[PDB]
Amino acid sequence: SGFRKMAFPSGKVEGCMVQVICGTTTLNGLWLDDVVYCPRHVICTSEDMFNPNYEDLLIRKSNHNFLVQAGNVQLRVIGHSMQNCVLKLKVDTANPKTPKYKFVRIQPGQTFSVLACYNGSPSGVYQCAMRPNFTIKGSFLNGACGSVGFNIDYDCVSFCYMHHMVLPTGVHAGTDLEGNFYGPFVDRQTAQAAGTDTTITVNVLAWLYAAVINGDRWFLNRFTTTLNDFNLVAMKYNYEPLTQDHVDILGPLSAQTGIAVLDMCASLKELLQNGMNGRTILGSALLEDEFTPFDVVRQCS
Amino acid sequence: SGFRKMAFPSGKVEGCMVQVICGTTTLNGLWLDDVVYCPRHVICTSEDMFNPNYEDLLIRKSNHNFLVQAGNVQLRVIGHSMQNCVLKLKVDTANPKTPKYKFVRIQPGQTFSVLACYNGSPSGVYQCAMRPNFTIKGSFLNGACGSVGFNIDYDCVSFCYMHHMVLPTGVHAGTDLEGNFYGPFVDRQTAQAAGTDTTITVNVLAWLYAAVINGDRWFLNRFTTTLNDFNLVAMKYNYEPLTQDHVDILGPLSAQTGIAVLDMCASLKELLQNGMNGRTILGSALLEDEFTPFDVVRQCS
Numbered sequence: 155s156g157f158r159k160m161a162f163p164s165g166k167v168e169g170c171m172v173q174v175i176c177g178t179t180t181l182n183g184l185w186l187d188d189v190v191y192c193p194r195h196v197i198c199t200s201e202d203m204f205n206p207n208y209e210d211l212l213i214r215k216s217n218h219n220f221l222v223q224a225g226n227v228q229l230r231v232i233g234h235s236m237q238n239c240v241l242k243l244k245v246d247t248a249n250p251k252t253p254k255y256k257f258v259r260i261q262p263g264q265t266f267s268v269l270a271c272y273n274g275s276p277s278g279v280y281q282c283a284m285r286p287n288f289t290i291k292g293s294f295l296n297g298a299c300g301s302v303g304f305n306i307d308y309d310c311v312s313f314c315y316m317h318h319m320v321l322p323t324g325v326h327a328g329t330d331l332e333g334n335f336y337g338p339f340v341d342r343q344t345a346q347a348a349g350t351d352t353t354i355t356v357n358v359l360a361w362l363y364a365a366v367i368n369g370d371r372w373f374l375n376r377f378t379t380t381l382n383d384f385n386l387v388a389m390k391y392n393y394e395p396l397t398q399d400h401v402d403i404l405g406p407l408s409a410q411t412g413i414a415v416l417d418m419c420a421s422l423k424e425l426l427q428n429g430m431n432g433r434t435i436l437g438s439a440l441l442e443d444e445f446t447p448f449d450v451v452r453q454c455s
Numbered sequence: 456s457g458f459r460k461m462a463f464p465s466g467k468v469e470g471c472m473v474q475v476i477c478g479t480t481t482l483n484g485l486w487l488d489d490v491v492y493c494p495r496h497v498i499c500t501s502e503d504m505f506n507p508n509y510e511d512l513l514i515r516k517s518n519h520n521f522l523v524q525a526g527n528v529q530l531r532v533i534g535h536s537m538q539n540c541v542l543k544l545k546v547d548t549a550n551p552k553t554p555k556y557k558f559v560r561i562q563p564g565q566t567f568s569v570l571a572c573y574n575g576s577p578s579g580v581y582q583c584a585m586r587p588n589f590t591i592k593g594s595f596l597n598g599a600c601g602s603v604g605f606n607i608d609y610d611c612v613s614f615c616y617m618h619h620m621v622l623p624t625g626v627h628a629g630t631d632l633e634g635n636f637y638g639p640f641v642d643r644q645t646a647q648a649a650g651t652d653t654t655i656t657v658n659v660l661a662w663l664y665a666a667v668i669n670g671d672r673w674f675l676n677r678f679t680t681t682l683n684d685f686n687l688v689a690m691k692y693n694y695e696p697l698t699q700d701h702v703d704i705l706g707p708l709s710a711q712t713g714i715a716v717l718d719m720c721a722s723l724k725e726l727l728q729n730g731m732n733g734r735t736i737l738g739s740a741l742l743e744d745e746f747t748p749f750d751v752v753r754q755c756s
């Protein structure tokens with residue numbers, strides 16, 4: 155066995171979620187050591203959302219204006235600061251459940267798990283991918299801001315995303331744990347286009363390699379193609395151009411299955427030019443691109 | 456917002472997973488209080504898998520033949536017992552991270568989160584549904600046995616599934632936390648048919664209600680139908696018969712959206728009789744049935 159979207163265990167992150175209240179606005183924060191990270195638009199009221207001056211708004215706020223609650227515990231704020239679009243509230247007590255972590259800015263096409271939280275309490279976890287346009291197709295309601303995306307390797311939690319806002323198309327935009335927005339998006343109430351949503355070609359191929367491993371093989375053909383020939387049939391369907399680095403990324407899967415990478419591209423070429431004819435690949439009627447060449451290997455071990 | 460499969464936070468369950476070793480076989484166990492639950496086929500060697508006599512095999516095992524490790528900790532077994540197809544290893548130390556739990560046998564059509572574990576360490580979490588044929592379409596490799604499915608309500612963890620084996624069709628079969636297999640499946644190495652895989656009609660309708668909430672509305676029509684008329688067009692496509700209880704289950708969503716239940720059935724009837732014509736509903740090209748009328752409400756709050 156089976157194959158399906160699988161998220162990392164959320165235990166390591168549940169212990170770092172807290173409630174942040176700045177006046178009327180309430181959202182979630184990340185408690186790591188003696189610091190709490192949250193979106194900086196907490197200081198925004200209701201009439202300061204079109205084009206707020208976070209510098210001026212932050213000057214009118216003091217330490218006692220921020221209330222952090224790790225459950226029923228009350229953390230004291232002994233210092234605040236604004237790094238890019240994130241607020242760093244220095245607290246007096248260090249999180250006793252702080253895991254080995256690190257802030258990383260993922261690349262477009264990589265996956266990560268999201269722990270959706272409301273009022274500081276986790277609600278659910280699901281897998282997401284950093285779309286080429288630097289957006290994420292997630293599920294967030296009002297109050298979900300502050301939720302983070304993370305990757306768990308061995309025992310080190312790698313935080314890479316913090317939710318900030320939604321876009322008119324329904325997709326979501328956020329920043330890394332250093333306050334740097336992913337994409338050209340800004341934290342101001344205004345319509346912002348995310349751009350054309352391209353398909354992660356390398357992930358689709360990895361999803362096809364996982365298919366041949368699980369028994370789905372009807373798409374395999376007697377055909378082959380060149381890298382330039384495939385990229386020409388991929389630009390028409392809005393597929394990211396496949397590079398030689400992508401081929402080497404899929405190397406382990408190729409030798410694992412015995413199907414050359416360029417042969418997989420030939421199968422994908424026909425799928426894009428002729429559809430699926432009602433068939434199903436790993437239980438899906440469409441080509442999935444949110445499975446990296448690394449999620450398949452760790453799930454098809 | 457957005458809509459997608461979302462699992463419960465796995466923190467409460469990660470603290471209850473342990474490694475169980477009975478000779479050469481090694482799998483996962485559930486540590487709750489001073490008892491460890493695991494599949495009873497741990498006592499099986501390699502030549503006792505076709506039709507093993509668990510009574511006789513268990514008589515040849517003593518307490519010191521079972522080794523439990525909660526990470527690097529070593530739990531002592533002071534008593535063992537066999538309840539149905541599950542082993543209850545009484546340990547000397549009670550789990551300090553035991554959450555408020557309860558063993559429940561879910562019904563066909565209900566959903567639950569699965570925490571896939573290998574060697575006692577959690578690997579990932581994903582949402583699953585109890586198929587009408589009493590199987591689950593999950594993702595398990597060798598050593599995944601002992602992993603459990605759970606539902607988290609407020610602060611009470613409701614365990615409802617423990618993985619035992621895979622079927623020839625790739626689907627998986629397991630038991631409740633009392634050792635009772637879901638379906639007519641038995642824990643013996645033999646080909647076992649799971650039966651026709653019916654579609655959870657009530658879940659598909661709830662998935663359509665969630666669609667209208669998120670903006671997907673092209674499937675809504677000027678048509679309506681009767682309950683018997685819909686059930687007749689559903690038996691041909693292997694859809695579970697819709698009952699009045701199902702209608703009342705969808706009541707809150709109906710009043711929430713203003714679309715009568717029988718009107719939704721009319722839209723589903725055309726979708727089954729005419730397909731999707733290449734469109735997409737909530738990012739899917741097929742009709743999803745693993746979203747209960749209760750997962751949509753808690754995700755579309």
Ligand SMILES: *C(=O)[C@H](C[C@@H]1CCNC1=O)NC(=O)[C@H](CC1CCCCC1)NC(=O)c1cc2ccccc2[nH]1
Nearest residue numbers: 195203294295296297298299319320341342343344345
């Ligand atoms: C965080 O708590 C929410 C998350 C939203 C709620 C609905 N779904 C989500 O993903 N964030 C917001 O509501 C932001 C708050 C703003 C405060 C002032 C600074 C900018 C962010 N707003 C938006 O997400 C927002 C505003 C807006 C205007 C026009 C089109 C879309 C749009 N989205």
Ligand SMILES: *C(=O)[C@H](C[C@@H]1CCNC1=O)NC(=O)[C@H](CC1CCCCC1)NC(=O)c1cc2ccccc2[nH]1
Nearest residue numbers: 496504595596597598599600620621642643644645646
């Ligand atoms: C648990 O550790 C595994 C889980 C499997 C491994 C591959 N994917 C899974 O979901 N369980 C097994 O391997 C069982 C072990 C048996 C021990 C003796 C008692 C019965 C279970 N076996 C099977 O899952 C199994 C045997 C078998 C024979 C014929 C067709 C299918 C089939 N599946």
